[PDB]
Amino acid sequence: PTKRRNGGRAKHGRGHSAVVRCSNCGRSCPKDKAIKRFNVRNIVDASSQRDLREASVYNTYTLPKLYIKQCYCVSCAIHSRVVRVRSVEQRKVRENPQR
C-alpha cells in the first residue's frame, strides 16, 4: 500500500529532478526528497562570545554568522533525530514546528 499519497519526493510534472549528495551519509538522493535544514548560526556559541566582546579591537563588532545548507538522506536524518517518525493521522501536517 501507499504509505504516502505524495511518495515523499514531492515531484509533479517532471520525470527527472536534480540530485544532491547527503552531507553525512554520502548517498545520492533526489534534491526534492533530500530533507533540508538551512542552519544559520553564529560562530562562537552564545556563552563564549562575550570573551570576543571583551578582548577585541573596535567599539562594538557584529560577530559574522556562519551560513550552510545541510542536506540529508532520510536514513541519516532518522538516525540523527532531525525528523524521527510520526503517526498515520499526524503525518499529513506540513507546517513549520519552530517558526
Binding site: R27, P64, L66
Partner: protein
C-alpha cells in the same frame, strides 16, 4: 612602537581529525608561528579535541608576544571543498586566543566552496557505516 596594535592573520583550519592554528603577516606570504593539534597531544583520537586546540593556541599566544604581534585578524576554515562544517577545535581555539590577550579583529569564514564541482567520495549509496 609608536602606533601600537600590529596585526597578523591567523588561519584556524579546523577539520575533523585535526586542528591547525597558523599565524602569518597581513601579506600572508611569511609565516610567524605554526601549531598542529597533534603536536600537543599524541593519541590520534584526541588530535581534533577541544583541549588539544586550546593547548595549541597557548603556544601560539606565547610565541606571538615575543616576535612583535599584539593583535590578530582571524580566518576560520572547515575542510570544506568537496567534503563545510568547522570542527570542535574551532570553538575552543578561538576562545583560547581571547584568554591569552591577543587583540582580536575581523572574523571571516573562508572555507572553500565550489559552484557545483567534481565528485564526492563513497559512491552512489554512500559511506554506509
Amino acid at each position: 612602537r609608536d602606533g601600537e596594535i600590529v596585526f597578523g592573520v591567523a588561519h584556524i583550519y579546523a577539520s575533523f581529525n585535526d586542528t591547525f592554528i597558523h599565524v602569518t603577516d597581513l601579506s600572508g606570504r611569511e609565516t610567524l608561528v605554526r601549531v598542529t593539534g597533534g603536536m600537543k597531544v599524541k593519541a590520534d583520537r584526541d588530535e581534533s579535541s577541544p583541549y588539544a586546540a586550546m593547548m595549541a593556541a597557548a603556544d601560539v599566544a606565547a610565541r606571538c608576544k615575543e616576535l612583535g604581534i599584539s593583535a590578530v585578524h582571524v580566518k576560520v576554515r572547515a575542510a570544506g571543498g568537496t567534503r563545510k562544517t568547522p570542527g570542535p577545535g574551532a570553538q575552543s581555539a578561538l576562545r583560547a586566543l581571547a584568554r591569552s590577550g591577543l587583540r582580536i579583529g575581523r572574523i571571516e569564514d573562508v572555507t572553500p566552496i565550489p559552484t557545483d564541482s567534481t565528485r564526492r567520495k563513497s559512491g552512489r549509496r554512500g559511506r554506509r557505516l
